[PDB]
Design a protein. Sequence first.
Length: 269
Amino acid sequence: EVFRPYAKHWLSPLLQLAASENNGGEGIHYMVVEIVATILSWTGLATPTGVPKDEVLANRLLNFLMKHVFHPKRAVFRHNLEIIKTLVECWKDCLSIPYRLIFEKFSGKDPNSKDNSVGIQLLGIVMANDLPPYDPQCGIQSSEYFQALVNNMSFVRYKEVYAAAAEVLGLILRYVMERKNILEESLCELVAKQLKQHQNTMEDKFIVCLNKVTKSFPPLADRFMNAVFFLLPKFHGVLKTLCLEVVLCRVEGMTELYFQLKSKDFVQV
């Protein structure tokens, strides 16, 4: 409260101490956690984008944050992602997005692990405010950048990679087709191709992926819902709720639909 009125010129030095590498402890440690839990309780009175030095310090802050958010045990990991989410929902204006570093997380070709996931959850964090990935500035060669992201659904060992992956590609398609873009169909037919290849050996993976996409971008199901009509008696149990939920996704555009739901024996289910 000594610093609650007098806070407007009190954001640079603590962020220097925070985002500096030498900080008395590695990782997102207790000092920088209480720094961010302090400074984010300054809404309205304080704003960082009035100087570009605070912008590059905020980029350095979130960059070092990105360098250290794994921390194997679960509760502090969710705490790390909570700190990330709070920063990019409070400040989020001078924090012009550092891409070209999430590629280093989700581009890990080891198809027997779960190390790739942190970049995907971060990708959901940065995206589902408003913001699109693949800025023109980051030199990633877009096809590779999106191909390595969309390959993540054959990673069928842990759910934490591919469930989150399909769930954020739904958000990708939703944001890139609410407003216009050239780069839409290059990814839409890409994720269509990925589902087209993965759909034929493992079916529950296909149906969970389609469920997660239809959470945010509906109409991709129509080119598979006829095959979901094909496999409507092929599942029984926990998968069936998601099986019927992808049906619920596309009903209002549909026309006949009751002959098919009838012919797959609606009364007993």
